[PDB]
Design a protein around this ligand. Structure first.
Ligand SMILES: CC(=O)CC(=O)SCCNC(=O)CCNC(=O)[C@H](O)C(C)(C)COP(=O)(O)OP(=O)(O)OC[C@H]1O[C@@H](n2cnc3c(N)ncnc32)[C@H](O)[C@@H]1OP(=O)(O)O
Ligand SMILES: CC(=O)CC(=O)SCCNC(=O)CCNC(=O)[C@H](O)C(C)(C)COP(=O)(O)OP(=O)(O)OC[C@H]1O[C@@H](n2cnc3c(N)ncnc32)[C@H](O)[C@@H]1OP(=O)(O)O
Ligand SMILES: Cc1cc2nc3c(=O)[nH]c(=O)nc-3n(C[C@H](O)[C@H](O)[C@H](O)COP(=O)(O)OP(=O)(O)OC[C@H]3O[C@@H](n4cnc5c(N)ncnc54)[C@H](O)[C@@H]3O)c2cc1C
Ligand SMILES: Cc1cc2nc3c(=O)[nH]c(=O)nc-3n(C[C@H](O)[C@H](O)[C@H](O)COP(=O)(O)OP(=O)(O)OC[C@H]3O[C@@H](n4cnc5c(N)ncnc54)[C@H](O)[C@@H]3O)c2cc1C
Ligand SMILES: Cc1cc2nc3c(=O)[nH]c(=O)nc-3n(C[C@H](O)[C@H](O)[C@H](O)COP(=O)(O)OP(=O)(O)OC[C@H]3O[C@@H](n4cnc5c(N)ncnc54)[C@H](O)[C@@H]3O)c2cc1C
Ligand SMILES: Cc1cc2nc3c(=O)[nH]c(=O)nc-3n(C[C@H](O)[C@H](O)[C@H](O)COP(=O)(O)OP(=O)(O)OC[C@H]3O[C@@H](n4cnc5c(N)ncnc54)[C@H](O)[C@@H]3O)c2cc1C
Lengths: 398, 397, 397, 398
């Protein structure tokens, strides 16, 4: 059948558009949008004050079949393609709730394990993940080291068949409701190469030495339990280490593409959200004898935004298609992420200007999405880094 | 002697720079800065939680002589010039403490009373205000009528020498600590336009009928008590009238320039703080054996912000000199409010970025400047309005 | 089977990339790229000084079959899908020779006739237009009206089955070389709107009263013979009428999407060429020791550039596919022309800067590119008018 | 007394505004304006075709006191304050005639000579130059070295009390009409950094081995005779050396501030010209029944342009004031050159878009302007070099 293009639809969020989809995805959509209308938005204004969401919507989440959607079915996941697990990405954005740490779990942590883990490890965790009992997260950053992920200090020493973890990890998405945490740690301090001596681990909550810090007070993402994680001589087991020892950077390198494709879709989706939202506010808010939307200026400001969102959507869709065939390279990934997150902010700022005074009020969706979008250029690897990598191929014959 | 302009100064916020100031102005600014570092900066974290600052501080600022600076001294104010009052707006900006509403109080509310109010009204209010015992505020906006003042539904019917007040004003600053508020009320539903039937009233705290509503929840300005104000049949005595009846729109007119200059200067000043703050951060944050300030991309992103800040500041300081002389017209003040307020957010944004993760943390001074910055392009008249006005001398003849 | 996207390709101009082309298209693109390299590129400077290309290059283009790559084989064209016609648009842009007014001929005029004209007309023109012996041009814009098309004044009055054409057009492409010009004229001086009283006419070089004005001096498109046209009491035989009398404007709205889409792709292809040409320069230009491609700022700029270009490229290849399926509406068509033409200029500005002073010398491809680009946001309907339209579906019904 | 500022005047280009000028200055402005109105504008098209102005307009300029205005009266110049010199800069800009290379001549070359030249040099050149009978041109950029001024190859080696000059310089304004050219050349290859091994040389039209190359084809400055220069084993006497040996790079870094300040003023002045040409155009253009000036989008775009132009002018005049007092540093000057030249191209682009199809026809002032403006961000130090220097004092503490 003929699916319309985003620019031609009645709404950017309209279900049933964009050729990278099929009628089967249409139906899975109603469900995810419906699930949020009933299980997420109704309580988010309560989880924000809390500093995290309930563990109750996490089990409901898994029970519904939205966690681990693109994780193979013969491992403990629904076993769908990417074209549909991203619909879970997109839909959370179309609801404006940055509390639930779904994707950071479904699309990233559930992906490392099912991709670089061992028989024992897969079965131990993948079922819990899809279930909703085990909450995943990852800790790469350190208060003193960041984009330079080559200069961290956390480490796990060689003790018997055990690894002794020592360190701290600031800024961890879902660092309070965590059960399983993929911590990046140095195993070779004298490692002749920053890349050659970093290992991955799966530290589990309930261990001696693993303390969780208070929920970090941020300017946005008020409902995300970001917190500092500590490691006080945690005696890890032989099942602790993930992938080969001193080969962490290798497993990380093969995941980023996906991570950035995710962050990206969300950004643009979140943009399609604010657009239709802002479009509505002006199509009614009356002034100077009729509506603001009757003003030429606003009409042109609107054309500019819809055009920029549409154009970028085409790129993100195109990137999803590639990734389906596993032919989406690290660079093309960095483009989608970089453009989409920079776009999300630009759109947010303008969209708030359009509400005027009520865009600063926490009551309207847009104000929350403003401080919610200023985290995109900062995490997942700053957009300054995205340029470095993109530029790698341009300037050097590598 | 000779002074340096922001560009050549060791730091944009140094004391003793910018040619529109004198040695005396410098001495004063040093005082005001000290005040903020010790009587405001230390309590802000609490006020943010509080959702409002203390009357304690407002009154300390009274003895100090920061309230009513450019208000004549033979009228209850401390009677300095415009540069001196400007200094207090700038200094509050340099402390990154949005909580205190000092500016609106002496820059706006107190001007309205000393410029159009009555002799008896002056005696009763000015000194109380210069001391900070009577915190003043102003309420023009209404839920659906902000950038269109003619569409204000708050009205005052006549009843003897009394006026009955009814209506609802949203977004009012200091609507939790306000003792005297200037309300914009329609007094003549019968007139060629609200611009001919509006009056200003001095609604005091405690008049039966004046319900100070709940503090609104915003994304920034966490320590400035922003609230809704309700008026139910308030019995306003003759004395409440400020200026001539149905002349409110004319007085508002006369004051708007200064209101725009004030935001102009706060905005540029706010940008000045962020810049020197971010500059410092990149010089300390370590990356690759060296500092992130060694990067060429960063170096350039800084030259851009600084250049755009130094440039805008020049214009704004040129507008301060023009207002001193009472020669800053409506358009020019609009240009200042516009360019500076717009510039403020673009500076906020590029600045959070250079902070990386932390810029997001409410721990860093910047994150608070970011949310405290998204307000400038909106209040005091959206930039869209400034453009329409600026454009009147351009397009029409 | 598998094809890389511009991002992964070794160059955005590489033959054999982009999902919307069959291995058959590749082979074709190679002959066209060969055509411009060998038949256009070497003689362009000569045409630049002359202000118009040779008739030879046109005929050479008809023989190679580039004129009407998407006009029905049975009507007199060479047939082929839109993706093919596009290649000829794209390849020209890639040679950076805005001289040949090929696209307007093939993609527009040849299309107005095989879409609304009679068989006598179709038969009489289409064969020689593809052969490149008859150069066509479109002429609607006038001295006082372009955007607001219903504001024209060229009129056609009936005198028998004959037509008396009067008026003038300005900014007409392929103007001095045109043998055939589709003129837009008001036929019904009184109707609901000029939108319902407009007709089309095929004016032929030779008819008495058809005077070709002086060639125009422009900042760019130096080899594009842009001229002014004058119609002095022209008696057009009945066959001159193209389409149902007083329906023209409706015919025009139908073809606009094509025009916009065309511009869109020329625009982005130009940017593709430009980025590639600049990446080349920065890598072979040394300074302070290593090349200027090593400098971190030069990289990040290139990265931004490559991104915005690949992102736009996609949206355009999206509109090509859509137009192939006869499914490209006005708005979507508008988005492409607008976003792309502006991205075009922006890329040009940055690319010149990257060349340093050499980016100002006519000798380097980047300078013609800069001035040749400034026209896209203007013709084919101004970017403002593009928005006005894209905004209708957004705001109204 | 009460001089209006650019925002308040009836026009940005009106005479008698801006607080940095005296009533005397206005009289002088009227004089200089009439001169372009009558002596330059009327003949510019023909110089455009020719690729150079006439020696006669230079001479008419010299006899009427427009050359060497800020040059010492007693040394040969007319002896006016910086502001008068600037007035000439500005008026040439207001006329939209970038043909006459007067600014480089009076503003750059003549300053170099009277600043670091001997008494014999001053007497031998200044009076001719103020008389427009001796045209000046500076030449330091080369086919392989521009931004990297420390990378030039042009050199001179001593031979008795003579110097042997060899090399080539590109992009030399006034290169065609020049009678004297200050040539930057290396005089000491063994210096630690070539910054200490450079010297200035007064090459004179006619010296053996001094060849004027091909007059360059550009996208703009069609009437500015920019050319390529050659020096093949020239025997320079001792007098030829301007200033002291190896102290060349020093004399230059000391003059740059004036080069950039001048470019900054020309830039913003060009922006004022374009504003008013366009304002007046949109106001007299009919479309859809009303003038285009009436379209709200057009008023805001115009309001933006004006505010940004008035704001930069404010910075620039403040910079002229500082320079007159000799207290304008390298960094400030750079901020000015940078911001203004960028704004110029920005304004030119918008202004062309408002003229519509006419802004592309050379017949219209705005077209000369758009192309003529693209060079400002490149010469006198590329805007990127401008940032390099501005950042220097932001990131480095004494
Ligand atoms: C590469 C190149 O070099 C090519 C070139 O530059 S050649 C020159 C290109 N020129 C252009 O593109 C001209 C640009 N102008 C336009 O697109 C339009 O004039 C415009 C966008 C400015 C809008 O003009 P407008 O006056 O608002 O037209 P609009 O409002 O749509 O007119 C309404 C009418 O359209 C009519 N209409 C349009 N298409 C119709 C159709 N197919 N069937 C029936 N009616 C139709 C409606 O009936 C409607 O009737 P009314 O006037 O009674 O309401
Ligand atoms: C319209 C027109 O006509 C305008 C034109 O285009 S004319 C030509 C315009 N050309 C330009 O503007 C060239 C632009 N380039 C430059 O200005 C410089 O090359 C530059 C800004 C890029 C800096 O170059 P650089 O190689 O980094 O120089 P830099 O590193 O600062 O050199 C350091 C030295 O300067 C020396 N220095 C500078 N001025 C000095 C002085 N006057 N006395 C003593 N030392 C001085 C310092 O002692 C220092 O010594 P070290 O070698 O021990 O470090
Ligand atoms: C809400 C939120 C959730 C997050 N969740 C996680 C998580 O779950 N796990 C985790 O480990 N981290 C997470 N982070 C942390 C985040 O990924 C890091 O803060 C970010 O990737 C790097 O920030 P930094 O300050 O450490 O980088 P810094 O090194 O401090 O960089 C500071 C500035 O210098 C710039 N700079 C440094 N190097 C370069 C360069 N090479 N070129 C140009 N500029 C450069 C940076 O881009 C940035 O602009 C999260 C952050 C936030 C805000
Ligand atoms: C935190 C905060 C503090 C404030 N403090 C005060 C205060 O103390 N006292 C007070 O009275 N008010 C104050 N305000 C209110 C503020 O001044 C008003 O919100 C503002 O003046 C008008 O915005 P609005 O909410 O009325 O939106 P509206 O004016 O209804 O709509 C504005 C939106 O439509 C656009 N629009 C409107 N008109 C035009 C136009 N003509 N052309 C093009 N676009 C247009 C605007 O640019 C913007 O996009 C404050 C507001 C906030 C948020
Ligand atoms: C080199 C070149 C080749 C061209 N070839 C052809 C050709 O072959 N045949 C042909 O007929 N034309 C052609 N044109 C002309 C071109 O199509 C028109 O110039 C253009 O479509 C409209 O410009 P205009 O001259 O009508 O300017 P105007 O329509 O007068 O517009 C002037 C300014 O007002 C703006 N404006 C107008 N209306 C609005 C509005 N409603 N809202 C907001 N802003 C508005 C315009 O965008 C512009 O900023 C060509 C132009 C050039 C330069
Ligand atoms: C019309 C015209 C007239 C001129 N008149 C004169 C004259 O009369 N006399 C004279 O000698 N010169 C003159 N010039 C030359 C001009 O000053 C130089 O072209 C300019 O200063 C440097 O450009 P370039 O050609 O050296 O480019 P390059 O310096 O070779 O390369 C410049 C490109 O690389 C970038 N780049 C280089 N270094 C850095 C850096 N370190 N960091 C970041 N980016 C960098 C530049 O920003 C730009 O993108 C003129 C030039 C033109 C165009």
């Amino acid at each position: 059948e003929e699916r319309l293009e985003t620019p031609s639809a009645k709404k950017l969020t309209d279900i049933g558009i964009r050729r990278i989809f099929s009628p089967e995805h249409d139906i899975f959509r109603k469900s995810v949008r419906k699930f949020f209308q009933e299980e997420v938005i109704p309580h988010h204004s309560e989880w924000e004050k809390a500093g995290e969401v309930s563990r109750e919507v996490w089990e409901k989440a898994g029970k519904q079949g939205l966690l681990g959607v693109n994780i193979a079915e013969h491992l403990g996941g629904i076993g769908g393609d990417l074209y549909s697990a991203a619909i879970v990405w997109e839909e959370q954005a179309y609801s404006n709730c940055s509390g639930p740490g779904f994707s950071i779990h479904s699309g990233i942590v559930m992906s490392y394990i099912t991709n670089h883990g061992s028989e024992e490890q897969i079965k131990h965790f993948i079922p819990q993940m899809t279930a909703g009992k085990c909450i995943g997260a990852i800790a790469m950053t350190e208060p003193g080291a960041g984009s330079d992920l080559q200069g961290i200090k956390t480490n796990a020493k060689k003790d018997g068949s055990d690894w002794i973890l020592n360190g701290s990890k600031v800024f961890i998405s879902n660092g309070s409701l965590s059960d399983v945490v993929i911590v990046v740690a140095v195993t070779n301090h004298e490692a002749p190469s920053p890349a050659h001596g970093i290992s991955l681990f799966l530290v589990e909550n309930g261990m001696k030495g693993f303390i969780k810090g208070r929920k970090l007070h941020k300017m946005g993402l008020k409902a995300q339990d970001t917190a500092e994680l500590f490691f006080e001589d945690i005696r890890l087991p032989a099942s602790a280490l993930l992938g080969e020892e001193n080969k962490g950077f290798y497993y990380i390198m093969k995941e980023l593409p996906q991570e950035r494709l995710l962050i990206a879709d969300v950004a643009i989706s979140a943009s399609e959200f604010m657009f239709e939202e802002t479009r509505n506010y002006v199509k009614q808010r009356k002034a100077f004898g009729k509506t603001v939307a009757h003003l030429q200026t606003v009409q042109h400001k609107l054309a500019e935004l819809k055009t920029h969102i549409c154009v970028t959507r085409a790129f993100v869709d195109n990137c999803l298609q590639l990734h389906e065939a596993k032919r989406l390279d690290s660079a093309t990934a960095c483009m989608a992420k970089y453009w989409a997150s920079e776009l999300q902010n630009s759109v947010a700022y303008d969209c708030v200007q359009l509400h005027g005074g009520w865009g600063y009020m926490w009551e309207y969706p847009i104000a929350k999405a403003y401080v919610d979008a200023r985290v995109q250029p900062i995490y997942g690897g700053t957009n300054e880094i995205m340029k470095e990598l993109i530029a790698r191929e341009i300037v050097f014959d590598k």
